[PDB]
Design an enzyme around this catalytic site. Structure first.
Site, PDB file in Angstrom:
ATOM      1  CD  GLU A   1      -2.320   4.479   2.420  1.00 42.93           C
ATOM      2  OE1 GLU A   1      -3.394   5.026   2.074  1.00 42.93           O
ATOM      3  OE2 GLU A   1      -1.962   3.392   1.945  1.00 42.93           O
TER       4      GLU A   1
ATOM      5  CB  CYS B   1      -6.574   0.024   4.328  1.00 45.05           C
ATOM      6  SG  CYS B   1      -5.048  -0.713   4.962  1.00 45.05           S
TER       7      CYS B   1
ATOM      8  CB  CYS C   1      -2.220   1.951   5.854  1.00 49.88           C
ATOM      9  SG  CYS C   1      -1.480   0.795   4.674  1.00 49.88           S
TER      10      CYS C   1
ATOM     11  CG  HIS D   1      -2.006  -1.021   1.119  1.00 47.65           C
ATOM     12  ND1 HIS D   1      -3.000  -1.123   2.063  1.00 47.65           N
ATOM     13  CD2 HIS D   1      -2.270  -1.971   0.188  1.00 47.65           C
ATOM     14  CE1 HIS D   1      -3.832  -2.092   1.723  1.00 47.65           C
ATOM     15  NE2 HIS D   1      -3.414  -2.618   0.583  1.00 47.65           N
TER      16      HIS D   1
HETATM   17 ZN   LIG Z   1      -3.380   0.079   3.621  1.00 48.82          ZN
END
Ligand SMILES: [Zn+2]
EC number: 3.5.4.38
Length: 191
Positions: A70, A99, A102, A68
């Site tokens: 992040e 999310c 994260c 991801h």
């Molecule tokens: Zn995430």
């Protein structure tokens, strides 16, 4: 190493940051960031540190399960070699909000790294399987300032990160109405 991309094509920006709430093919998260250092009660921009990135999709010769945006962002911070005697403000403009896992990692990072203040501006709230309220509150509880991107922030990111060749930021349809709705949502979440 810390030399991330500095500029994106205009359609990359427009497609990803358009703040209609629907996924509509926006499977990636783009995260643009800037870093400032405190000096004499003023935030001083460190322009060489700026950049943007996106999530890495699952790839055989990348991350098998993806990474991801992040997490990629958190991975770059130690490579900046920030002076631990100074104070910094890191501002990130995200096309989707994080999310939950994260948001949890970001909250942990800022709890432990007290030389860093984090400001997040997001174009859209990613529902995150019904967890977005929890993720946003977890970030806020750890000290992050969370806001919704409005016209001024979209314009700022366009001016700063897009290869616009002097062309102005030209709002897509509904920009203000989407920003106002999302801001009302975030105000409720944070209280
Ligand atoms: Zn995430």
């Amino acid at each position: 190493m810390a030399s991330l991309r500095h500029s994106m094509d205009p359609p990359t920006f427009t497609f990803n940051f358009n703040n209609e709430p629907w996924v509509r093919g926006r499977h990636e998260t783009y995260l643009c960031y800037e870093v400032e250092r405190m000096h004499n009660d003023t935030w001083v921009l460190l322009n060489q540190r700026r950049g943007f990135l996106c999530n890495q999709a699952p790839h055989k010769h990348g991350f098998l399960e993806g990474r991801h945006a992040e997490l990629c962002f958190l991975d770059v911070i130690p490579f900046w070699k920030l002076d631990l005697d100074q104070d910094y403000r890191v501002t990130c403009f995200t096309s989707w909000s994080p999310c939950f896992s994260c948001a949890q990692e970001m909250a942990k990072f800022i709890s432990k790294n007290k030389h860093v203040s984090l400001c997040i501006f997001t174009a859209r709230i990613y529902d995150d399987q019904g967890r977005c309220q929890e993720g946003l509150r977890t970030l806020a509880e750890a000290g992050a300032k969370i806001s919704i991107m409005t016209y001024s922030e979209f314009k700022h990111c366009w001016d700063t990160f897009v290869d616009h060749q002097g062309c102005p930021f030209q709002p897509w349809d509904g920009l203000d109405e989407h920003s106002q709705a999302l801001s009302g949502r975030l105000r409720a979440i944070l209280q």
